Amino acid sequence: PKIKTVRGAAKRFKKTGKGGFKHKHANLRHILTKKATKRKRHLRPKAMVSKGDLGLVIACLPYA
């Protein structure tokens, strides 16, 4: 049968031009006020999926 994508991971990772995957930073949901503005500012932009984690994202997204 067709492989089923992990739908939770498909809603959080997008494939990039060179095959990478971008995801949003953690730690920015509901305890952010006590965090310095510089810390929040660095967490706002999108990030690249790490070399250690490359296999898991691709595994969750086999068709994309």
Binding site: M48, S50, K51, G52, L54, G55, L56, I58, A59
Partner: protein, 51 residues
């Protein structure tokens, strides 16, 4: 002889755990991937030459 059934003691996961690099097809990082950071032989400077 890993990944061969329940009786083997390494079945249904093949000793690979739950959704890690070792359980994925073609997964695992090669030697020296250091999480995203420039590895130690690059934070640190190169030195010497072969004569």
């Amino acid at each position: 002889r890993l990944g061969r059934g329940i009786g083997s003691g390494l079945g249904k996961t093949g000793g690979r755990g739950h959704k890690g690099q070792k359980s994925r097809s073609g997964g695992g990082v090669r030697r020296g991937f250091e999480g995203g950071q420039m590895p130690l032989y690059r934070r640190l400077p190169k030195f010497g030459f072969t004569s």
